[PDB]
Design a protein around this ligand. Structure first.
Ligand SMILES: CCCCCCCC/C=C\CCCCCCCC(=O)OC[C@H](COP(=O)(O)OCC[N+](C)(C)C)OC(=O)CCCCCCC/C=C/CCCCCCCC
Ligand SMILES: CCCCCCCC/C=C\CCCCCCCC(=O)OC[C@H](COP(=O)(O)OCC[N+](C)(C)C)OC(=O)CCCCCCC/C=C/CCCCCCCC
Ligand SMILES: CCCCCCCCCCCCOCCOCCOCCOCCOCCOCCOCCOCCO
Ligand SMILES: CCCCCCCCCCCCOCCOCCOCCOCCOCCOCCOCCOCCO
Ligand SMILES: CNCc1cc(-c2ccccc2F)n(S(=O)(=O)c2cccnc2)c1
Ligand SMILES: *[C@@H]1O[C@H](CO)[C@@H](O)[C@H](O)[C@H]1NC(C)=O
Ligand SMILES: *[C@@H]1O[C@H](CO)[C@@H](O)[C@H](O)[C@H]1NC(C)=O
Ligand SMILES: *[C@@H]1O[C@H](CO)[C@@H](O)[C@H](O)[C@H]1NC(C)=O
Lengths: 977, 257
């Protein structure tokens, strides 16, 4: 519906908007139009309430498993205050504890997301933008947000384009659309309708963009959300954020847990009722078992581990918006990546020169950390003189601390690039320029198509003039007649014109913008000091000049980018360019950064070298491929899959926002986990549909950053590789921390399974299972986060999401029903020892529960015939608690040690080398002892000061665990079969 | 096809092995264990005391009956009968008339079938409260007989000087009447020292705790009252806030008419 404006007659536009095309909007009428349509800006995302942003942290796979758990607990506790006088209420304790970790975690997640979006928001430099409006025939400055539709505005070089502007008249006006399109080079804006699609016309300038040079005036066509900017952003509303690979994995093992809890609970409900229990209590143990499979501290510890990895990345200027994202880059198999502003710096900089019959190569990095070119020659010193003197750009004041590549410049596009180039080669270009007073100058026009100026020289012993000129290379060549070479100034014979033309076309072939420079020193005889030059009379030479050289410019990669791409591919990650820019530039940078490897070629390159039609080229031979948006429009999805499968190094050029999203989708659907990296609004849509969206912090648009899960605060593309590494550690390490945390759940449950099916006195209490789950084993299990890697992690392929899971059925089966088994026979041996040494032999212990718990027996007889009161039996039960607990703790020192490694032996990688883990074993044993031997503890937490034989009964079982896992791991190590 | 067998057989192998290991732990533990003396007596610091006939309420021992309604006390008496059916001359043959009056230490096993000697204690020693001449143990009068029994702990010694007595008195003595007058059987209310020390069920298969009867005489009818009934012996403590049966027994009592 937007299309109407750029195709109208100026009469029609004045009609539509009740405006003048030269004197502009009336003042009152623009006041009213502001009341009608609101301010001219994008209305921010709707903005969800604070209390609901808390509410959503309490939801999630583990969390819901825990809410169902506490649900079951309260249903059972109600059944049990109905079923006789029981003041046991364990399910009150457990359910309220579950709610407790879910909630406290919730606070922690909410607070992390708070602090992270303050860290992101606080680098957003919200400074109000302005606009030159003309109203009642007056040119003045108003805030951009007060522009109503129909206003007459003006733009010049430097200005930010304030609204969506349809251009009535323009002098040499070029513009920077890289936030909207891909295009890295300045885009001409002229008033004539060149397309019906308003994106591809030249008579609209876009709401967010930058006017680089020239001048235009035009009428306001959309304000705010209604602009192409707000439309492309509103596209990212219609993109739904699928759930992260880590969230999937958590939900997978929540499913495994749920399976087990049902299978068990059912099996022992059948058994419970075959032992002659009432159906109504067999349901209560069904319930207790089902809940008993739900770990209580897991959600806490993983939410600590992710948080520590976030702290690591935040340290490296990589702020993450929510904890799940710290994993995603580790699981990623492709990176769909924007070109301009992402891989590149979005800054045209001098990259090459042609002088002394050679193509030199300037250092295009932003930190200036590469190979500069040879500056010995007289030819260079001259060529530097021309490009330094023939130039009107100037640094804004007080920028001496700012590195030169980042400095703001009041100039044109090419002139800015060259001014930074002189400042980094010659040093202090503007003073140098002052030393050679400009006496005459033709600026760039459309008549001549070159810029020239004449200057008096430096010292007084030379009183000559020097004419310097620059322009399109062919146009400079025809106007001059000799060439500087090596101290010679030789005649420009046929071969020099052919070699010049060869160089010009080579730098054009690498997608760079070539400018030719030239000079002529003027005689004292003909042009003596004080001579009145006249640009219209042209009373000086514009011909027969002397060629200096060619200087050529490009939008060049960010310094750390080529290496970052290198490492991602070393680590099995397919990098794809998805850029809106034109194919030739796209392919140049795709060479420069390592997306297209040195020596691979497209099918068009093969045809071009072999001299064959492209019909005959065997596509299998072409490792690289460039596809623009047009060919991608006439492609079945099957053809896209054929191209992605066939050509390893893929480059998509001239790609619309929606086409980026479609390439993300095609990979995703093919099984990829996709990361996209992006500069601006155009890449914002891809950013949302991505498994992980990475926005550039500085270069990035509010739309991009908002879509992204992660912000590179300093635009350091190498952060990406750190993301890969930290997401590959924290995954392997979580697989460790979980394996540890899950293994205590079988020794915590077999007591109750026996206590039911055998009617032994209760070996292990609820009040102490809580201490294990939430106190003693927390710091060990979090310490596993700090494990170093067990391989060259960044040389491993990305994990297969359908085969390699966080928790497999083999992993569970091992941790539960083998390491957990050994822990349960440990505890039960310490149980029967603790009782027999106190008076109760095992054979007596079967069936003894009814009498054990009876308050109406204060003279129950042990195996020696002695008579215990109920309270005395109870302090014995607490002793049973404390020995089963300590059996579990010793076996969880063995657990934390064997779970340091999944492959390697403890002898190789070590024992004491994870220092946080050691501090946590000391901590675990200290809390243990405080719970045992502090006074008052038998009454407050039901822990007895156990004797020192009871610690050692588990030692052989602990060492047995250690040896058992070593033999398994050495089986895998020394035998892949 | 046939590999689930090769892994499940690994699990049955693993659980059989691990079970056997546990078995040998038990077996070896069951030779740590002396058949006559427990290794530690860590929670039997002082003996528990139990009452009889024991009837329990929401808050503990709660005995309540009606002198005119034998329904409300036949049961009580019939427990005192069943309780004392093992203090009959008939079922006391395995024990001997100890008359020693001081501790009956035995280091060797000089009693039939490689055992030790336990003392006789027969119902008729509770005299009036022995179920003769009154088969209602004093309930039908309103002067009931409560049998007090001190829990046996192996080789526990109450005190060398006197025999341990049972002092039985009001918790809150009604403030319009006198202290609780009780008549004990035996007469001072004592457990005679030749019943101590207990050597265990294997050692003295025929052992029977000394009982002392407390005949409560002047309890006011139709009033809720609480009787504390503690044991006075040197090695016997009765002030434990987390076991109200260590060294004593409290009970609420109301006799209705
Ligand atoms: C990873 C971090 C997670 C976030 C923390 C959440 C923790 C919440 C866990 C549980 C809360 C439920 C307990 C609250 C209820 C207190 C009730 C009370 O009135 O209590 C008295 C009882 C003693 O009962 P009894 O058995 O003697 O009665 C026997 C009664 N008859 C005889 C009738 C049977 O005691 C008790 O139940 C208390 C039992 C409590 C068990 C605690 C488990 C260990 C948790 C450690 C977390 C420490 C965090 C510290 C943070 C510091 C930051 C600066
Ligand atoms: C799916 C996996 C299931 C695994 C379940 C465990 C199965 C194995 C368990 C028991 C098998 C028999 C083990 C006991 C026999 C040991 C050998 C033996 O001959 O020793 C003699 C004892 C003593 O004899 P006494 O006391 O009469 O004389 C007293 C002796 N004087 C007088 C000298 C002191 O004989 C005794 O006590 C006999 C005691 C028998 C009852 C033991 C208590 C049962 C408790 C079981 C809990 C098991 C936990 C399972 C954890 C699995 C984790 C997944
Ligand atoms: C089938 C596996 C069984 C393994 C058991 C092997 C070890 C068995 C322990 C016996 C070894 C003999 O040495 C005894 C060790 O005890 C030494 C501790 O001495 C410290 C003092 O202990 C006092 C009690 O603690 C204080 C609280 O109690 C009062
Ligand atoms: C699987 C069976 C395990 C048997 C455990 C045997 C325990 C032996 C304990 C020996 C401890 C020493 O005696 C305890 C008294 O210590 C006195 C000093 O304090
Ligand atoms: C979640 N894994 C730890 C866990 C939690 C419980 C539990 C279940 C129901 C109610 C209260 C509980 F603490 N159990 S338990 O084996 O069922 C059990 C053990 C001892 C006493 N009662 C029950 C095991
Ligand atoms: C038990 O021995 C005593 C000791 O003097 C004796 O007087 C009494 O007759 C005996 N009682 C019997 C055998 O019933
Ligand atoms: C015990 O009963 C007898 C009657 O058989 C009597 O001589 C004696 O006084 C009674 N003692 C008490 C305290 O009632
Ligand atoms: C029990 O005593 C009550 C007084 O509480 C009396 O009313 C009643 O008659 C007695 N019982 C019978 C069965 O008479």
């Amino acid at each position: 519906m937007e299309i109407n404006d750029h195709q109208l007659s100026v009469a029609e536009l004045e009609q539509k908007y009740q405006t003048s095309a030269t004197k502009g909007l009336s003042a009152s009428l623009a006041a009213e139009l502001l009341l009608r349509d609101g301010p001219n800006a994008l209305r921010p995302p709707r903005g969800t309430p604070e209390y609901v942003k808390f509410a959503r942290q309490l939801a999630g796979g583990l969390q819901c498993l825990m809410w169902v758990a506490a649900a079951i607990c309260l249903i059972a506790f109600a059944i049990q205050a109905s079923e006789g006088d029981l003041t046991t209420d364990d399910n009150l304790y457990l359910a309220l504890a579950l709610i407790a970790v879910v909630v406290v975690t919730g606070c922690f997640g909410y607070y992390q997301e708070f602090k992270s979006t303050n860290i992101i928001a606080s680098f957003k430099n919200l400074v109000p933008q302005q606009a030159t409006v003309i109203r009642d025939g007056d040119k003045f400055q108003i805030n951009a947000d007060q522009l109503v539709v129909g206003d007459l505005v003006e733009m010049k070089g430097g200005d930010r384009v304030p609204a969506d502007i349809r251009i009535l008249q323009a002098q040499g006006c070029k513009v920077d659309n890289s936030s909207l399109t891909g295009e890295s080079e300045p885009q001409t804006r002229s008033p004539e309708c060149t397309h019906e699609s308003p994106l591809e016309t030249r008579n609209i300038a876009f709401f967010s963009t930058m006017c680089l040079e020239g001048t235009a005036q035009g009428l306001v066509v959309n304000t705010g959300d209604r602009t192409i900017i707000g439309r492309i952003a509103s596209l990212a509303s219609g993109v739904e954020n699928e759930k992260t690979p880590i969230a999937i994995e958590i939900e997978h093992f929540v499913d495994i847990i749920a399976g087990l809890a049902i299978l068990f609970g059912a099996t022992f409900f059948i058994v419970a009722m075959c032992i002659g229990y009432t159906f109504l209590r067999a349901m209560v143990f069904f319930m207790a078992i089902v809940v008993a499979y739900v770990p209580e501290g897991l959600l806490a510890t993983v939410t600590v581990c992710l948080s520590l990895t976030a702290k690591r990345l935040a340290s490296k200027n990589c702020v993450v918006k929510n904890l799940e994202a710290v994993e995603t880059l580790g699981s990623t198999s492709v990176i769909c990546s924007d070109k301009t502003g992402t891989l590149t710096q979005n800054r045209m900089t001098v990259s090459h020169l042609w002088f002394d019959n050679h193509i030199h190569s300037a250092d295009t990095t932003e930190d200036q950390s590469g190979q500069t070119f040879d500056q010995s020659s007289e030819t260079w010193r001259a060529l530097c003189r021309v490009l330094t003197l023939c130039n009107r750009a100037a640094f804004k004041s007080g920028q001496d601390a700012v590195p030169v590549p980042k400095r703001i410049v009041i100039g044109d596009a090419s002139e800015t690039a060259l001014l930074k180039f002189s400042e980094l080669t010659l040093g202090n270009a503007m003073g140098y320029r002052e030393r050679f007073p400009k006496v005459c100058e033709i600026p760039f026009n459309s008549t001549n198509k070159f810029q020239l100026s004449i200057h008096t020289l430096e010292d007084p012993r030379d009183p000559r003039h020097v004419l310097v000129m620059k322009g399109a290379p062919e146009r400079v060549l025809e106007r001059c007649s000799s060439i500087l070479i090596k101290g010679q100034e030789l005649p420009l014979d046929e071969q020099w014109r052919e070699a010049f033309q060869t160089a010009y076309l080579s730098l054009g072939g690498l997608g760079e913008r070539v400018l030719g420079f030239c000079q002529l020193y003027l005689s004292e005889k003909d042009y003596p000091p004080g001579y009145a030059f006249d640009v219209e009379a042209m009373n000086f030479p514009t011909s027969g000049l002397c060629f200096a050289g060619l200087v050529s410019m490009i939008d060049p990669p960010r310094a750390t980018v080529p290496d970052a791409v290198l490492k991602c591919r070393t680590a099995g990650i397919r990098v794809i360019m998805v850029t809106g820019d034109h194919p030739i530039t796209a392919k140049a940078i795709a060479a420069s950064v390592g997306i297209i490897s040195e020596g691979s070629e497209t099918v068009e390159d093969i045809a071009a070298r072999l001299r064959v039609p492209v019909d005959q080229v065997n596509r299998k031979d072409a490792r690289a491929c460039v596809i623009n948006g047009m060919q991608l429009k006439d492609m079945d999805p099957s053809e896209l899959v054929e191209a992605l499968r066939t050509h390893p190094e893929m480059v998509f050029a001239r790609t619309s926002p929606q086409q980026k999203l479609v390439i993300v989708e095609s990979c995703q659907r093919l099984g990829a986990i996709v990361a996209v990296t992006g500069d601006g609004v155009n890449d914002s849509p891809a950013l949302k549909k991505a498994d992980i969206g990475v926005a550039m912090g500085i270069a990035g648009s509010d739309a991009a950053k908002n879509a992204a899960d992660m912000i590179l605060l300093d635009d350091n593309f190498a952060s990406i590789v750190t993301g890969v590494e930290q997401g590959r550690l924290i995954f392997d390490n979580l697989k460790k921390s979980i394996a540890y945390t899950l293994t205590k759940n079988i020794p915590e449950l077999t007591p109750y399974l026996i206590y039911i099916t055998v009617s032994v006195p209760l070996p292990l209490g609820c009040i102490t299972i809580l201490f294990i789950e939430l106190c003693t084993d927390i710091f060990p299990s979090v310490s596993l986060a700090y494990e170093k890697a067990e391989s060259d992690i960044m040389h491993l392929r990305p994990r297969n999401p359908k085969r390699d899971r966080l928790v497999n059925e083999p992993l569970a089966a091992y941790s539960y029903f083998q390491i957990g088994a050994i822990q349960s026979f440990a505890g039960f041996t310490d149980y029967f020892t603790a009782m027999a040494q106190e008076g109760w032999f095992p054979l007596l212990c079967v069936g003894l529960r009814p009498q054990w718990e009876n308050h109406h027996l204060q003279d129950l007889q042990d195996s020696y015939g002695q008579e215990w009161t109920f309270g005395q039996r109870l302090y014995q039960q607490y002793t049973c608690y404390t020995v089963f607990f300590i059996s579990i703790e010793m076996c969880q020192i063995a657990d934390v040690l064997i779970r340091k490694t999944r492959r390697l032996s403890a002898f190789q990688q070590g024992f004491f080398r994870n220092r946080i883990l050691v501090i946590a074993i000391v901590f675990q044993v200290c809390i243990g002892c405080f719970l045992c031997y502090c006074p008052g503890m038998p009454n407050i937490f039901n822990f007895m000061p156990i004797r020192f034989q009871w610690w050692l009964v588990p030692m052989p079982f602990s060492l047995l665990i250690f040896v058992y896992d070593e033999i398994r791991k050495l089986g895998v190590r020394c035998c892949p079969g | 096809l046939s590999r689930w067998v090769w892994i499940s057989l690994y699990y049955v192998a693993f659980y059989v092995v691990m079970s056997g290991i546990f078995a040998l732990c038990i077996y070896v533990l069951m030779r740590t264990i002396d058949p006559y003396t427990p290794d530690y007596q860590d929670q039997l610091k002082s003996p528990g005391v139990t009452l009889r006939p024991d009837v329990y309420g929401e808050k503990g021992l709660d005995i309540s009956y009606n002198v005119s309604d034998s329904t409300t006390w036949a049961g009580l008496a019939h427990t005192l009968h069943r309780f004392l059916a093992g203090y009959s001359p008939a079922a006391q043959e395995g024990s001997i008339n100890c008359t020693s009056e001081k501790y009956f230490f035995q280091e060797s096993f000089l009693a039939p079938n490689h055992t030790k000697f336990s003392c006789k204690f027969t119902a008729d020693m509770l005299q009036n409260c022995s179920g003769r001449p009154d088969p209602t143990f004093g309930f039908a009068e309103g002067k009931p007989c409560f049998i007090i029994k001190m829990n046996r702990i192996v080789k526990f010694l109450p005190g060398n000087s006197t025999a341990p007595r049972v002092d039985c008195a009001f918790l809150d003595q009604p403030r319009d009447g006198p202290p609780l007058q009780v008549e004990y059987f035996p007469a001072n209310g004592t457990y005679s020292l030749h019943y101590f020390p207990y050597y265990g069920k294997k050692a003295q298969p025929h052992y029977s705790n000394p009982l002392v009867a407390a005949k409560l005489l002047n309890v006011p009818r139709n009033r809720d009252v609480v009787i504390v009934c503690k044991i006075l012996a040197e090695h016997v403590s009765f002030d434990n806030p987390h076991d109200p049966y260590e060294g004593k027994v409290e009970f609420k009592l109301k006799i209705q008419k």
